[PDB]
Amino acid sequence: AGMSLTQVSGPVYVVEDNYYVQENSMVYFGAKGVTVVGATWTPDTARELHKLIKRVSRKPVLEVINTNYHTDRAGGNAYWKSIGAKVVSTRQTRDLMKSDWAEIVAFTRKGLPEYPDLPLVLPNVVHDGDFTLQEGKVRAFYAGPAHTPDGIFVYFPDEQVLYGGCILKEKLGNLSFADVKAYPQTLERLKAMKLPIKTVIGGHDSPLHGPELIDHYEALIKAAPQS
Ligand SMILES: O=P(O)(O)[C@H](S)c1ccc(Cl)cc1Cl
Numbered sequence: 001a002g003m004s005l006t007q008v009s010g011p012v013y014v015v016e017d018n019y020y021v022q023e024n025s026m027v028y029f030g031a032k033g034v035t036v037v038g039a040t041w042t043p044d045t046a047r048e049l050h051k052l053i054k055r056v057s058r059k060p061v062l063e064v065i066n067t068n069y070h071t072d073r074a075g076g077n078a079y080w081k082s083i084g085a086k087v088v089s090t091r092q093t094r095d096l097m098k099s100d101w102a103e104i105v106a107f108t109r110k111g112l113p114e115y116p117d118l119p120l121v122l123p124n125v126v127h128d129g130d131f132t133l134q135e136g137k138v139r140a141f142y143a144g145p146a147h148t149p150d151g152i153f154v155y156f157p158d159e160q161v162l163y164g165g166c167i168l169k170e171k172l173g174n175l176s177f178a179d180v181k182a183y184p185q186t187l188e189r190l191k192a193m194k195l196p197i198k199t200v201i202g203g204h205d206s207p208l209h210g211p212e213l214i215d216h217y218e219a220l221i222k223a224a225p226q227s
Pocket residue numbers: 021022023070072107108109111112166172173174175204
């Protein structure tokens with residue numbers, strides 16, 4: 001299918017968004033409503049995710065987290081706002097989105113000419129530090145710069161699932177926005193937290209991995225140019 005929504009553990013689901021270059025995002029089905037982690041590529045892909053959500057739950061979509069300011073994590077924002085969901089990020093992500101959205105849309109369209117020229121749609125709930133949702137069961141945090149300066153992790157403690165958006169994946173990927181020397185330092189700050197982790201969801205490539213995806217990507221980025 002163009003997009004799938006599949007249970008990984010309990011209320012934690014993975015979105016495989018096969019539009020453009022495949023990106024994987026998360027959905028958490030909570031008591032009061034639904035939290036989406038990663039807005040998906042465009043308002044149209046966001047609508048496709050919402051259609052899948054409505055086959056699982058009638059509860060409202062409460063909020064969507066932009067794990068960084070890029071098009072694959074924030075492009076769906078216009079749709080989420082339109083249905084009354086909050087769009088949530090760190091202040092750093094929001095500020096970078098304000099200044100750099102035009103640049104990232106242009107960069108996206110260089111690789112994907114078919115991708116739309118999306119207007120800026122900023123987060124309307126901004127956090128200055130780490131933050132939680134769903135009565136503490138969805139936990140967002142910053143551990144330093146990596147793939148972009150601002151990317152955050154989202155941890156689901158009950159299910160021992162870690163999502164890093166674009167930070168964790170199988171292939172090296174684009175480093176044009178990256179801090180190549182800080183990247184492994186951020187991954188080591190992450191590992192030093194000693195979070196119980198059964199599953200890491202990669203943000204690109206095949207999503208389902210164990211904790212070893214962190215070490216896999218760390219070894220790749222240490223061999224990269226500018227390391
Ligand atoms: O940098 P990432 O991991 O988001 C990935 S490698 C990426 C790079 C360029 C373009 Cl146009 C699309 C994508 Cl999905």
